[PDB]
Amino acid sequence: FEGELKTLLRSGKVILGTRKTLKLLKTGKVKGVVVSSTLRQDLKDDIMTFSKFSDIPIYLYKGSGYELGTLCGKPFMVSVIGIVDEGESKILEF
RNA sequence: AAGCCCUUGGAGAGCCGUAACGGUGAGAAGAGGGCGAAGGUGUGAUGGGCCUUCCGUUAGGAGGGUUCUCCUGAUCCCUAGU
């Protein structure tokens, strides 16, 4: 997973944070979403509800928002990642 | 006003902020808003009560003024922190 995520952020277009990627999910404008396991429960089952209405891949990350933020290189936590453009990586088949 | 809420917005190797601790992608600053102390300002009140002058000096009667610019201040009151 980390191999594709390295390539995804190098060339693709990405959205960090719950609020911005939650609105795009309701209108069906994200290719895919990855969720860390430490996200708040009220927001996690909102992701799962709106995902069944549009057939968008959902990936459940094992770690927390801190080692998900560190993978992106961003100095603080990111709990939800919205994939709006794959770029050239091969992540969207998961 | 503090505090807590609501839309928008989208930040980092940084920004915002306190008397201090601090806050932030689980969404900061910036823009607008909602609920919101003690008190204050009007009305209550050409009502009083306060200072004062003159006459008759019995009973009383007839007038005048009650404005303006600042400072300090609780161990009383309400409001948030830690």
CA distance A72 to A78: 8
Considering all nucleic acid strands, name the nucleotide whose C1' atom is nearest to the C-alpha of residue A43.
Answer: B26
Resolution of the coordinates, Å: 2.7
In the numeric block, the tokens 């309701």 are attached to A26
- Counting beta carbons within 10 angstroms of the beta carbon of residue A46, is it exposed (0 to 12), middle (13 to 18) or buried (19 or more)? middle
Considering all nucleic acid strands, name the nucleotide whose C1' atom is nearest to the C-alpha of residue A74.
Answer: B12
Protein CA at A70 to nucleotide C1' at B45, angstroms? 73
Nearest Cα residue to A52 out of A25, A16, A31, A30:
A25
Nearest Cα residue to A81 out of A89, A90, A71:
A71
CA distance A26 to A36: 19
The technique by which this structure was obtained is: cryo-EM
